[PDB]
Structures are given as structure tokens and as C-alpha cells.
Amino acid sequence: QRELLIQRLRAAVHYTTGCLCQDVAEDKGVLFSKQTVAAISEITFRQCENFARDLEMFARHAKRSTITSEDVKLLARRSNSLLKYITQKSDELASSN
Amino acid sequence: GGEQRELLIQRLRAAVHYTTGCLCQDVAEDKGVLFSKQTVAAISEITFRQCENFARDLEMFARHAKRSTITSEDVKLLARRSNSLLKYITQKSDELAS
Amino acid sequence: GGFRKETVERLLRLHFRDGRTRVNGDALLLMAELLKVFVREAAARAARQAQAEDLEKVDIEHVEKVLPQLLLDFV
Amino acid sequence: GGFRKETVERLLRLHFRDGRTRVNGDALLLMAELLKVFVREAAARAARQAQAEDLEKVDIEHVEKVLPQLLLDFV
Known part of the structure; x- marks a missing residue:
């Protein structure tokens, strides 16, 4: 069950990774091997454990059970460019109205 | 001027270098190896540099909680990804204030 | 995507x-959005390494070369 | 200390x-305390990498080798 769930989610991430790599391939004029795309998909899948656990802990740090844009922005804190980009996306969302 | 910060930086680098030397001395005895002066210096520089991330994180972790003053809670959060380290630091903290 | x-x-x-x-x-x-930037950053950096190697083709070795630093900026 | x-x-x-x-x-x-742990970890892993090579003296190469994993572990 949980294992089927895992294989489901690996496959969905793998498909979405395939799409994104095709975009970078054309844009950069390179070809990504299937194994390369596979490897990137698996890295991304594994990373989610850290993202999830950090977010949870970041929200609990602020005494919240619910994760918010703030926690996500915090996650992006290491790269100045990344933090800048996510922050902007965050601001677009909050301005939704 | 700006050269004050630079003097402060060489001061702190040198203070970290000394303590790093002391700590490496202990590890070289336990492990029965020798640490070249180049190695000690490199470990020291790395450690000095690593304080940039610790400091940035402590500040933002506290701010995340709407706090200007960094507390032991923030420092524990630094160790979150590692269960053994978190437990070490968690234990150290409770071993401290008490 | x-x-x-x-x-x-x-x-x-x-x-x-x-x-x-x-x-x-x-x-x-x-x-x-963060997950998508991550994927693209992984891909772009691996593409950049391959090109630095004068290659038009990106292999798993290019991914593994760039991974440690990548994980350093996505903390 | x-x-x-x-x-x-x-x-x-x-x-x-x-x-x-x-x-x-x-x-x-x-x-x-945390900074002490990190120095001593840096030192032990560099040491570890050296006698893994059957060497009693740790050089900057050993340090360089263990650096990426050391830093990931403190992210």
C-alpha cells in the first residue's frame, strides 16, 4: 500500500521531471539521457523528505500546525537568487485578490 | 573605517585558528594521526566560513518565530536534520540551564 | 511542465x-514552484557541466558531479 | 576546552x-558546543580519510575529500 503509493509518486515525479528536462534540453541545446532524467527524478523524489520535514519543523517553530508561504520562503533562504524568486512568487499569490 | 572590520576579521580568524588547533590536537591523539599545520589551518578556515550559515540561520529562525533574540530553541533547530546530533545538542542544552 | x-x-x-x-x-x-526550480536547476547545472566537458550529451556522471554543490544551495 | x-x-x-x-x-x-562538534567532526573525518589510505599524516587533500559530505551534514 504505502509502497504502491511510493511507486505512484516516483512515477509522477519522474514524468514531470521528464517534461522539465525536455524544456532545459531545447533551451540549452543538449540531450539528456534517459538515465540522466531518471537520476534527476530520483534525487528530486529523495529531496522531498528533507523539504517536508524542514517545513513541518519550520511551522512548528512558529507554533503552527499549518505550513505557509513563510515556511516555504525560509526553505529557500540559502540562495539569494532563489529566495528572491520564491519570495516574488509568494507575493504574487498573496496578492491573489 | 572598513579596515576595522578587517582587523576584527583577522582577530576572529586567529581565535578560531587557536581553538581549532586545540581541538585537532585532541583528535590526533585519539586517532593516533598527525595533522599538518596546513590541515589545521584549512579546518580552521572552513569552520570560520561555516559560521556565516549558522549565523544567518539562527537569525532567520528566531525572526521566523517573531523573535529578535536567538534562544536555545533556534540552536536546536540548526541540528534538526541529524537525530544523533539533535539529541546531543538537545541534551547539552538541558544539561546547561539546569 | x-x-x-x-x-x-x-x-x-x-x-x-x-x-x-x-x-x-x-x-x-x-x-x-520550488520543486520545479529545483528540477530545472539540477538539469541546467548538469547541462552546464556536460558543455564544460565539450559535450552535447548529458549523462549521469554530469549529474553526480554537480549534485553536492546543488544540495549545498537547496538546503 | x-x-x-x-x-x-x-x-x-x-x-x-x-x-x-x-x-x-x-x-x-x-x-x-555545536562549533566544537563541527571542528572535531571535520578533524575526525579527515583523519578517517587518511588512515583509510594507510597514512598517519593528514593533508589538505583529506580535508578537501571529506568537505562536501561534512557541509551537507551541517546544512
Whole structure:
């Protein structure tokens, strides 16, 4: 069950990774091997454990059970460019109205 | 001027270098190896540099909680990804204030 | 190309340790966006390494070369 | 026996971006501890890498080799 769930989610991430790599391939004029795309998909899948656990802990740090844009922005804190980009996306969302 | 910060930086680098030397001395005895002066210096520089991330994180972790003053809670959060380290630091903290 | 909020939510829920934990709507969309930047950054850096090697083809060795630094900036 | 409170405080103040930021006394002692752990981990892994090569002297190469994993572990 949980294992089927895992294989489901690996496959969905793998498909979405395939799409994104095709975009970078054309844009950069390179070809990504299937194994390369596979490897990137698996890295991304594994990373989610850290993202999830950090977010949870970041929200609990602020005494919240619910994760918010703030926690996500915090996650992006290491790269100045990344933090800048996510922050902007965050601001677009909050301005939704 | 700006050269004050630079003097402060060489001061702190040198203070970290000394303590790093002391700590490496202990590890070289336990492990029965020798640490070249180049190695000690490199470990020291790395450690000095690593304080940039610790400091940035402590500040933002506290701010995340709407706090200007960094507390032991923030420092524990630094160790979150590692269960053994978190437990070490968690234990150290409770071993401290008490 | 992009991650669906439902995929992202199940990915996160996989790893949550507290049963109370939830994700709000904007955060899900933001996280989807972060996950996509991550993938593209991985791909771009691996492409950059291959090109530095004078290659038009990106292999798993290019991915593994760039991974440590990548993980350094996505902390 | 390790890092001094005043050294640790100065080290952190060097990098704070906000003039409001302060650090309570126990956080400092705790941070001095964490910095001690990190130096000793850096040293042990470098040492570890050297006698793995059957060498009694640790060089900057050993340090360089263990550096990426060391830093990931402190992210």
C-alpha cells in the first residue's frame, strides 16, 4: 500500500521531471539521457523528505500546525537568487485578490 | 573605517585558528594521526566560513518565530536534520540551564 | 511542465512526522514552484557541466558531479 | 576546552543582517558546543580519510575529500 503509493509518486515525479528536462534540453541545446532524467527524478523524489520535514519543523517553530508561504520562503533562504524568486512568487499569490 | 572590520576579521580568524588547533590536537591523539599545520589551518578556515550559515540561520529562525533574540530553541533547530546530533545538542542544552 | 498540487501534497505527507501537520493552499503552489526550480536547476547545472566537458550529451556522471554543490544551495 | 562565549558571539554578530538581532547566554554556550562538534567532526573525518589510505599524516587533500559530505551534514 504505502509502497504502491511510493511507486505512484516516483512515477509522477519522474514524468514531470521528464517534461522539465525536455524544456532545459531545447533551451540549452543538449540531450539528456534517459538515465540522466531518471537520476534527476530520483534525487528530486529523495529531496522531498528533507523539504517536508524542514517545513513541518519550520511551522512548528512558529507554533503552527499549518505550513505557509513563510515556511516555504525560509526553505529557500540559502540562495539569494532563489529566495528572491520564491519570495516574488509568494507575493504574487498573496496578492491573489 | 572598513579596515576595522578587517582587523576584527583577522582577530576572529586567529581565535578560531587557536581553538581549532586545540581541538585537532585532541583528535590526533585519539586517532593516533598527525595533522599538518596546513590541515589545521584549512579546518580552521572552513569552520570560520561555516559560521556565516549558522549565523544567518539562527537569525532567520528566531525572526521566523517573531523573535529578535536567538534562544536555545533556534540552536536546536540548526541540528534538526541529524537525530544523533539533535539529541546531543538537545541534551547539552538541558544539561546547561539546569 | 509543472508539478500538480496533489502530487506535491502527497509527497510532503509521505514524510510528515506529526499527524496535525497540514499545508495551506498558497504554500502548496509555492512548493510546487520550488520543486520545479529545483528540477530545472539540477538539469541546467548538469547541462552546464556536460558543455564544460565539450559535450552535447548529458549523462549521469554530469549529474553526480554537480549534485553536492546543488544540495549545498537547496538546503 | 573549546570556543569562548565572547568569540562565538563576535563570530555570529559578524554575519547578522539585522541590527536588532541578539543571542541569549545559553544559546551562545550551546552554539560554542555545536562549533566544537563541527571542528572535531571535520578533524575526525579527515583523519578517517587518511588512515583509510594507510597514512598517519593528514593533508589538505583529506580535508578537501571529506568537505562536501561534512557541509551537507551541517546544512
